[PDB]
From a paper:
If the HK incorporates a REC domain (REC-1) is denoted as hybrid histidine kinase (hHK), and the first His-Asp phosphotransfer event occurs in the same polypeptide chain. Then, HPt protein containing a phosphorylatable His shuffles the phosphoryl group from the phosphorylatable Asp in the REC-1 domain to the phosphorylatable Asp in the REC domain of an RR (REC-2) in two more phosphotransfer steps. In fungi, the HPt accepts the phosphoryl group from REC-1 domains of various hHKs upstream of the signaling pathway and forwards it downstream to REC-2 domains present in at least two conserved RRs, Ssk1 and Skn7. Also, we have obtained the crystal structures of Ct_HPt alone and in complex with REChHK6 bound to the phosphomimetic BeF3−, as well as the crystal structures of REChHK3 and RECCa_Sln1.
To analyze differences in the structure of Ct_HPt before and after binding to REChHK6, we obtained the crystal structure of isolated Ct_HPt. It contained four molecules in the AU and each molecule contributed to an interface area of ~800 Å2 between two molecules. The interface area contained several salt bridges between two Arg residues located in αE (R158 and R169) and two Glu residues located in αB (E82 and E89). Interestingly, R158 formed intrachain salt bridges with E82 and E89, as well as an interchain salt bridge with E82, while R169 formed an interchain salt bridge with E89. According to the EPPIC and PISA servers this interface was the result of crystal packing and SEC-MALS analysis with Ct_HPt indicated a MW of 18.1 kDa (theoretical MW is 18.7 kDa) demonstrating the presence of the monomeric species in solution. Finally, the structural comparison between Ct_HPt isolated and bound to REChHK6 demonstrated high structural similarity between them (rmsd of ~0.9 Å for 129 residues), although slight structural changes were observed in the N-terminal region, αA, loop αA–αB and loop αD–αE. Meanwhile, the intrachain salt bridge nucleated by R158 in αE with E82 and E89 in αB is also present and has not been disturbed. This fact indicates that Ct_HPt shows little plasticity, a useful conserved feature to be recognized similarly by several REC-1 domains. Finally, our studies have uncovered two salt bridges in Ct_HPt between two Glu residues in αB and an Arg residue in αE that provide bundle stability. As these residues seem rather conserved between human fungal pathogens, except in S. cerevisiae, we envision that these salt bridges could be present in other HPt proteins. These salt bridges do not intervene in complex recognition but seem to provide bundle stability preventing conformational plasticity.
Author numbering: 43 to 63, 65 to 174
Write the structure that this text describes.
Amino acid sequence: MPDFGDHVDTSIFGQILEMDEDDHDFSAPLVLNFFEQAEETFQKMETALNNKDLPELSKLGHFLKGSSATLGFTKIRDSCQLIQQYGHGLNVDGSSEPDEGVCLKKIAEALASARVDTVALHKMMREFFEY
């Protein structure tokens, strides 16, 4: 009975859980790798924000969307989707956004969300894998 609320897609992550032979031999190493990797990615997003590098932010966004999607971590993936789009000058209505200043700001907002939601999910997983 694991409730991750809006953070986890039960179908996608559930499939992962069913691959365990009840010590989480497969799922937990994978969750750990996701989080270690996630934080390396955020550091780079931080650096890219400092240097105001929209193209790099987009790539970083695209990458973390893909790894989070594979685990069914949908709240993180949606934040990463935002970073991908705004990096390419596309708003959430899908319109062009020429003003780089606004894109940067939006990405910052989205990155703060992704980071916070990653923390919250990491806590819930630690609890799950310690039972």
